[PDB]
Design a binder for this molecule. Structure first.
Ligand SMILES: C[S@@+](CC[C@H](N)C(=O)[O-])C[C@H]1O[C@@H](n2cnc3c(N)ncnc32)[C@H](O)[C@@H]1O
Ligand SMILES: CSC[C@H]1O[C@@H](n2cnc3c(N)ncnc32)[C@H](O)[C@@H]1O
Ligand code: SF4
Ligand code: SF4
Lengths: 318, 314
């Protein structure tokens, strides 16, 4: 990533103190970057040592005690006074993986989505698809993120476009799964780190979640989990869910925490939990919890306030 | 503890929202207590789910969104306007351990110190020591109770006497008293009813090795905790400047929890901990790189003679 701009920014503004925040994969570079900033500018650097899961997870205590917080690795989320997002993009060629998925397309209007690592390469991919003879749309998502076509585990607005199928560019199965479910459209996952392209079927995902719903039908006491992280806090929803719970003869207790981990939930024995924090906790960490952990809408289905056929992906709406 | 004073407090103050914070051993009670408050009052309850290590670790985000935060298991400290502290007094008998410690006494004026759980039983212990024919004194804001010591606070032992009896379990508090005051300390455990003189020579030798391992270090991480009662950023900035004065480099790392996992994420050779002093001592062998107290870091830098090492107090 572009360290020269960071130094120029600091050096132009005569920053007394500078803050650095890294996602877990980038922390190994934190000390090298702080060295570069202290060597080449006059600012003192404070490093954030908490786990950081994304731009939903800004260290606002550190931002409020430094002149500028550089948050690395993610597209911007929200609107912060003195937080500067440093994007950190990937070099990997995605066009070989794009052409691979072209042989699986069964429609002519193709929507393109990807993650922040690859978003600067979508236009290239859009022109390959268009020369192959197809139409290609890239929707706009979070307006506070400079690049369109970007999806998050909690945000599928870049997939709400006039198109027939989607090519998702990236690794991992969660995002194309969520798009498929949120759009009811066919999603082809093109992994550029493998030069392979496969269709994603959400039926297996949907069966597993129906199993957690079924598994919680007998639950009487629910822990409703709230996170204080800057972009994950949904207390208003949590209080509605408590009221819904009580309306159906069940009991919910609101548990407010920072990190949402199986170990901390194990300390409060309830029959099931409802996670209003990061939606990916519910899915990626499902098997690590000692009792069923439900999205807010799955909870509604468990109590009767929503029908199974209306189950939507959990999306971050604070 | 007293549920009835909690409910009375909630109803008289007309609370609509109440917070509960517990240490890890008491968290298994959180749901029962929340249920009791919701059944017997009009308040809605929010339970803090974070780990909580003491009255140094108030959940201030929760406190800021409720009318009253009940904090269980520690004595108060600091001054938070809407935080009520609900102490957990131990009711174990300490007098036999006191009587067992009389035999090891060498002097005539004895100081008494203990942890917060036993602090209401020190008067009785004082009478016993008096009847034995000795003088007994119980020394006196963080450690708000007479005779109470904390891992980060030994002011109750800054009292005029020749010898100390520590009543409680563990060796950190009596070791700390012995290092802070250079007096003889007898530790009297009321659960086992045993008493032994505590001598710091082996502890200091162990701390000396971590200083030795850290003198070779190129890059220090200077740890600051944002916890309400552990935050020492000013100290961190002083340490960073003094290190630089000696041609050594430290970077400040600001975090909430201070764990070996979060520190392994960074490529520093050694760490200076400005947060809870017990982390440095009790979690020592769990860290990949050596963790120092501020005073041990001063020794590594030649700012402080090894002979003048002292306990890290908040
Ligand atoms: C890999 S990151 C999400 C990747 C990226 N943010 C995205 O757009 O999909 C997701 C993981 O972060 C962890 N996580 C997120 N929020 C958390 C929280 N509040 N407490 C503990 N873990 C959290 C969960 O384990 C979850 O599986
Ligand atoms: C509760 S008694 C002191 C212990 O609490 C834990 N502890 C105290 N403060 C912190 C902190 N800020 N982060 C992580 N652990 C802590 C450490 O293990 C210490 O040994
Ligand atoms: S999926 Fe979870 S970790 Fe990723 S941005 Fe959304 S809330 Fe944050
Ligand atoms: S020893 Fe640590 S945990 Fe105990 S009160 Fe002092 S700072 Fe808090």
């Amino acid at each position: 990533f572009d360290l020269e701009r960071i130094l120029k920014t600091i050096k132009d503004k005569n920053c007394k103190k500078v803050g650095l925040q890294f996602p877990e994969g980038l922390k190994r570079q934190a000390i090298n970057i702080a060295r570069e900033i202290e060597e080449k500018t006059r600012a003192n650097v404070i490093i954030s040592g908490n786990p950081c899961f994304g731009a939903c997870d800004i260290d606002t205590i550190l931002a409020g005690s430094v002149d500028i917080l550089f948050h690395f690795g993610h597209a911007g989320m929200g609107e912060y006074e003195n937080v500067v997002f440093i994007e950190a993009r990937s070099n990997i060629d995605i066009i070989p993986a794009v052409k691979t998925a072209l042989n699986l397309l069964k429609a002519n209007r193709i929507g393109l989505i990807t993650t922040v690592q690859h978003v600067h390469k979508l236009e290239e991919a859009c022109k390959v698809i268009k020369e192959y003879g197809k139409e290609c749309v890239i929707g706009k998502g979070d307006p506070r993120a400079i690049y369109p076509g970007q999806v998050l585990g909690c945000n599928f607005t870049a997939a709400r476009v006039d198109c027939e199928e989607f090519i998702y560019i990236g690794s991992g199965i969660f995002h194309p799964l969520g798009v498929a479910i949120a759009t009811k459209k066919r999603v082809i996952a093109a992994d550029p780190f493998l030069n392979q392209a496969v269709e994603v079927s959400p039926e297996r995902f949907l069966r597993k979640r129906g199993g957690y719903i079924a598994k919680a039908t007998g639950a009487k006491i629910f822990g409703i989990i709230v996170s204080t992280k800057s972009g994950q806090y949904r207390m208003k929803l949590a209080q509605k869910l408590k009221e819904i719970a009580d309306k159906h003869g069940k009991i919910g207790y609101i548990i407010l925490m920072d990190l949402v981990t199986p170990e901390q939930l194990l300390a409060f024995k309830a029959d099931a939990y409802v996670n209003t924090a990061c939606p990916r906790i519910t899915i990626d960490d499902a098997e690590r919890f000692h009792a069923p952990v439900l999205t807010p809408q799955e909870f509604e289905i468990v109590l009767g306030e929503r029908r199974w056929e209306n189950m939507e992906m959990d999306e971050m709406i604070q």
